[PDB]
Amino acid sequence: TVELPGIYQTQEFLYMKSSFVEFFEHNGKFYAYGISDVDGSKAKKDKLNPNPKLRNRSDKGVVFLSDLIKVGKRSYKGGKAYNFYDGKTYYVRVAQNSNGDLEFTSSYDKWGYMGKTFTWKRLSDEEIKNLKLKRFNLDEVLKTIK
Numbered sequence: 001t002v003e004l005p006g007i008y009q010t011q012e013f014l015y016m017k018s019s020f021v022e023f024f025e026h027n028g029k030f031y032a033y034g035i036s037d038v039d040g041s042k043a044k045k046d047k048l049n050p051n052p053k054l055r056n057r058s059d060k061g062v063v064f065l066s067d068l069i070k071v072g073k074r075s076y077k078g079g080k081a082y083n084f085y086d087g088k089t090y091y092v093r094v095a096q097n098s099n100g101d102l103e104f105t106s107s108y109d110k111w112g113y114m115g116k117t118f119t120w121k122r123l124s125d126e127e128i129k130n131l132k133l134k135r136f137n138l139d140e141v142l143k144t145i146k
Contacts, residue, residue, distance in 0.1 A: 033061060
């Protein structure tokens with residue numbers, strides 16, 4: 001079967017670059033953190049965080065998506081995504097395809113209607129291996145929620 005935990009490649013949109021991200025579960029809900037940008041570039045600081053005491057943390061290895069609940073066999077809701085490129089938090093829902101890819105809906109908008117849907121490709125273990133992607137340890141990544 002397909003599951004959400006995994007590594008995906010996000011969709012380029014405006015000044016927001018394609019990036020590799022990892023989804024994981026904890027206490028029954030799903031979360032995600034950023035690994036690196038597709039073009040290999042260096043991790044930068046969270047300069048636009050509304051909270052001044054957070055502007056020092058990296059945009060990589062840090063949880064930007066939290067609180068996603070599985071509601072159907074391939075269906076998730078209730079999530080909230082922080083966006084490093086603008087400092088805003090968006091409501092997120094996700095539908096997963098049978099090949100594992102995500103239709104990732106980002107909105108304003110608890111119900112998802114005043115938002116946009118992107119497609120995030122699932123990576124196989126072979127691609128993850130060949131891109132030399134770093135999988136961060138998850139206890140440390142968890143401390144990153146506040």
